[PDB]
C-alpha cells in the first residue's frame, strides 16, 4: 500500500520506494532518491537539489509538491518521472512552470501563486484554501475554443479563493465532496473571455 | 537538399520546411514554425517567443542556435524537436540550460558563455573563436570516472579560448581540420580533476 514519512529526510539520506503510494519530504538532497511504482508523492522544501542529488518518481502517476517560492521542474534533469505538480506548504508561493506536467494541484499556501506554460487538457484541482489570487496562464490562450477544467475537491466546505483564467472560453467547474455529508464550496472566478461556465459535481458552489 | 535564409523572418511570417537541411533566423515569432524532416537549423534572437508562437524542429537531428543572453529551451514547450544546442551570434552570451539536448556547439560570441545541466555523454564542438571563458558544468560531476568529449572543428587555425571542465576525470580532445591544408588549434583547458587528457584528430593543438 505504501509508506508515508511526514518528517523531512536528512540531506544525506537515501530513500527507496516500492509499489504503492509512498510519500516523503525532501530538502537539498545529496543522494539519488527513487520512488518505485504506484502513485507516489514527494514534497520539496527547496527548488534545486544539491551535490547530486536527484529524485525519480518511477512508474505510475506521481505528484511533486512544491513548498517553494517558484519552480521549474521540467528544466532540471534532477527531477524525472513526475506527472502532477501541486503547490502546497507553508513556504509555497509565486511563479511555477507547469510545463511537462499532465495535471495540477493546489493546497494551502504562503501567498499568491501562478501556473505558467500550462498545456491544453491540463486541469487544476484545488484541495484546500490557498492564500492570494491563483493565476493560471495557458501555454497558448490565443484560439477561440479554449477549455479549462477546474476541480474543487474536499471533505468539508472549501474556500477556493480567486482563480484567474485569462483567455479561456469554456470554464468547467467540478465541485466535489469526498464524504457523505453535504457542503457548499466558494470561488471567485476571473475569466473575462469565458462564454460558457459548466458546473458539475455533488457539492454546492 | 534544403533552403537556407540568412535574413531574420518577420515576427508575423509563417515558415514551413520539407525534408533536407532547411535553415532560418527567428525573432519573437507569433506563428507556428515547422521545420519538417532532415537536419535543420533555427537561430533565435530572442529567448522566449510571443503571442503563440512556437517552433518545432520536426524529425532528424536539428540544431537550435541561441543568439541571446541566456536560454532555457527545455522548459519552454514553445520549442520542441531539437537535439543540439549551439551558442553563436553577436548577442550570444551568458548562462544556457543544456538540459534535454544530446549535443552542444559553440561559435563566435558576445561574451563569456556557460552550459549548465549538461547530461552524461554530451560533448561540446567548438566551431569558431568565442569571447570569454566557456564554462561547462555537468548535470552530475560528483563521480570519479567522469568523461567529457571536447571537439575543435574548423577549416583554419582555431583559438578555442578557455574552456573550464570542473569535475571531469578524462578529457578527450579531438582537434579536427575540415580541409586538406594543415593547421594548429589553441586552447586553454581548466580541468582541475582530470587525470587523463587524450588528444585525437588531424590538426595540431
Ligand atoms: Ca512507490
Ligand atoms: Ca511511482
Ligand atoms: Ca511516473
Ligand atoms: Ca523533469
Ligand atoms: Ca462534505
Ligand atoms: Ca482565447
Ligand atoms: Ca477567459
Ligand atoms: Ca527540413
Ligand atoms: Ca528537422
Ligand atoms: Ca527542446
Ligand atoms: Ca528533431
Ligand atoms: Ca586547415
Ligand atoms: Ca568528477
Ligand atoms: Ca576536471
Residues 6+ apart with CB under 8 A from B38: B2, B17, B18, B19, B20, B21, B22, B59, B60
Laid out side by side, the sheet with B159-164 consists of B94-97, B113-118, B134-138, B159-164, B186-190
CB atoms A76 and B99 under 8 Å: yes
The answer to whether B140 contacts chain A (CB < 8 Å) is yes
The answer to whether B51 contacts chain A (CB < 8 Å) is yes
Chosen for mutation from B95, B139, B143 (greatest number of chain A CBs closer than 10 Å) is B139
The answer to whether B72 contacts chain A (CB < 8 Å) is yes
> Which of B54, B99, B142 lies closest to A75 in CB terms?
B99
CB of A160 closer than 8 Å to CB of A131: no
Give the torsion sign (CA, A42, A43, A49, A51): negative
Q: Which residue of A has its CA nearest to B74?
A: A75
CB atoms A142 and B97 under 8 Å: no
Distances (CA, A) of B70 to A69, B7, B29, B111: 21, 22, 18, 11
Distance from CA of A77 to the nearest CA of B (A): 6
Residues 6+ apart with CB under 8 A from B180: none
User: What is the CA(B31)–ligand 6 centre distance, in A?
Assistant: 15
Distances (CA, A) of A179 to A35, A151, A153, A157, A174: 29, 16, 10, 11, 15
Cell numbers found for residue A119: 498545456
Surface-to-core class of residue B142, CB atoms within 10 Å of its CB (0-12 exposed, 13-18 middle, 19+ buried): exposed
* Method of determination used here: X-ray
CB of A83 closer than 8 Å to CB of A125: no
Cell numbers found for residue B132: 570569454
> Which of A51, A52, A74 lies closest to B74 in CB terms?
A74
CB of B107 closer than 8 Å to CB of B96: no
For the CA of A142, the nearest ligand: 6
The answer to whether B119 contacts chain A (CB < 8 Å) is yes
Q: Which residues surround ligand 3, an ion (CB under 5 A)?
A: A 57, 62, 81
Q: What pairs with residue A173 in β-bridges?
A: A150, A199
Kindly provide the resolution of this structure in angstroms, with one decimal. Answer: 2.7
CB of B112 closer than 8 Å to CB of B131: yes
Q: What is the DSSP string of B134-176?
A: EEEEES---SS--EEEEEEEESS--EEEEEE-TT-SEEEEEEE
Strands B186-190 and B159-164 come out as: parallel
The answer to whether B141 contacts chain A (CB < 8 Å) is yes
CB atoms B139 and A78 under 8 Å: yes
The answer to whether A4 contacts chain B (CB < 8 Å) is no
CB of A93 closer than 8 Å to CB of A75: no
Interface A-B, measured as beta-carbon pairs within 8 A, has a size of 44
Cell numbers found for residue B19: 525534408
The answer to whether B142 contacts chain A (CB < 8 Å) is yes
Q: Which residue of B has its CA nearest to A52?
A: B140
Distance from CA of A151 to the nearest CA of B (A): 24
Amino acid at each position: 500500500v505504501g509508506a508515508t514519512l511526514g518528517a523531512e529526510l536528512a540531506t544525506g539520506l537515501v530513500f527507496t520506494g516500492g509499489a504503492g503510494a509512498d510519500s516523503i519530504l525532501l530538502g537539498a538532497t545529496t543522494k539519488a532518491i527513487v520512488m518505485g511504482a504506484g502513485d507516489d508523492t514527494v514534497t520539496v522544501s527547496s527548488a534545486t537539489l544539491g551535490a547530486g542529488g536527484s529524485v525519480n518518481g518511477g512508474d505510475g502517476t506521481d505528484v511533486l509538491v512544491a513548498n517553494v517560492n517558484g519552480s521549474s521542474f521540467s528544466a532540471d534533469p534532477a527531477f524525472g518521472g513526475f506527472e502532477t505538480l501541486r503547490v502546497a506548504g507553508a513556504a509555497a508561493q509565486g511563479s511555477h512552470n507547469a510545463n511537462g506536467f499532465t495535471a495540477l494541484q493546489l493546497g494551502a499556501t504562503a501567498g499568491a501563486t501562478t501556473f505558467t506554460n500550462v498545456a491544453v487538457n491540463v486541469g487544476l484541482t484545488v484541495l484546500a484554501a490557498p492564500t492570494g489570487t491563483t493565476t493560471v496562464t495557458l501555454a497558448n490562450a490565443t484560439g477561440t475554443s479554449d477549455v479549462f477544467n477546474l476541480t474543487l475537491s474536499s471533505s468539508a466546505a472549501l474556500a477556493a479563493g480567486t482563480v484567474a483564467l485569462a483567455g479561456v472560453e469554456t470554464v468547467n467547474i467540478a465541485a466535489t465532496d469526498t464524504n457523505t455529508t453535504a457542503h457548499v464550496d466558494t470561488l471567485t472566478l476571473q475569466a473575462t473571455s469565458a462564454k460558457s461556465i459548466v458546473v458539475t459535481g455533488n457539492a454546492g458552489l
